[PDB]
Amino acid sequence: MITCRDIITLGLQQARVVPLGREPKAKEADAGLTVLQSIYDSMFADGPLGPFTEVYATSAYTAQENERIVTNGAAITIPQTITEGNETRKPYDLTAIIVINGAAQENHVFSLGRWQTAHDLTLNSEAPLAERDKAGLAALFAMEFAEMFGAELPPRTTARGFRFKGAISQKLATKRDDPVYY
Amino acid sequence: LEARKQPATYFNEVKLSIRGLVGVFEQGDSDPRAWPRNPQDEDSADIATK
Numbered sequence: 001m002i003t004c005r006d007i008i009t010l011g012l013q014q015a016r017v018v019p020l021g022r023e024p025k026a027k028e029a030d031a032g033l034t035v036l037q038s039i040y041d042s043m044f045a046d047g048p049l050g051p052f053t054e055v056y057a058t059s060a061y062t063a064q065e066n067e068r069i070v071t072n073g074a075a076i077t078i079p080q081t082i083t084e085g086n087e088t089r090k091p092y093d094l095t096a097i098i099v100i101n102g103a104a105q106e107n108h109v110f111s112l113g114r115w116q117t118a119h120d121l122t123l124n125s126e127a128p129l130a131e132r133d134k135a136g137l138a139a140l141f142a143m144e145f146a147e148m149f150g151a152e153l154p155p156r157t158t159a160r161g162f163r164f165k166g167a168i169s170q171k172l173a174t175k176r177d178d179p180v181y182y
Numbered sequence: 183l184e185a186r187k188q189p190a191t192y193f194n195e196v197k198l199s200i201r202g203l204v205g206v207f208e209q210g211d212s213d214p215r216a217w218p219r220n221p222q223d224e225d226s227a228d229i230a231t232k
Binding site: 178 | 186187188189
């Protein structure tokens with residue numbers, strides 16, 4: 001379970017501001033939480049997690065793919081399996097679900113067989129979609145978080161983070177069909 | 183060709199060259215006939231073509 005504070009510890013010694021083996025202090029590892037929350041929250045709003053579909057139902061509705069639920073009082077259940085004519089499949093890789101009550105947003109994302117949670121992301125909870133790589137997610141974090149300090153990231157590891165942002169902005173992992181010769 | 187997912191097209195341009203060449207022979211057909219070589223009692227023996 002890769003916690004949130006493992007990224008901020010890896011992110012800070014990535015930009016060589018804390019040394020190897022020592023941990024961040026209290027004021028350093030609590031300003032990094034508000035900016036690591038901001039990058040995860042700006043991916044469901046309008047970013048590489050795909051466009052969303054509006055819906056307004058006040059009933060026992062179950063959510064579909066890529067659908068932003070804005071119900072007021074209801075029971076919205078995120079599906080685990082989907083049966084498209086006995087094609088009992090799991091959902092696609094990196095497709096999100098938003099549920100919005102009166103004032104509380106709860107985003108969701110399905111990355112490698114598990115629904116990550118990605119809201120109210122505290123210092124103990126696991127980071128969403130960091131199982132794909134750990135040292136790539138700490139370079140996209142520390143790319144702009146290091147600017148409040150003096151330092152900046154070197155170019156051999158800056159372009160590592162721009163690969164991770166493009167590896168989830170394309171969803172090119174799942175195999176698709178060949179050209180057709182029609 | 184099936185491993186490239188390609189159709190296997192052919193342009194059968196060798197049936198055209200035979201179908202119109204049999205049709206020349208087939209139209210100009212013939213019934214047989216015997217020709218008496220000298221008309222001194224040889225046309226009377228041309229019952230053979232009948």
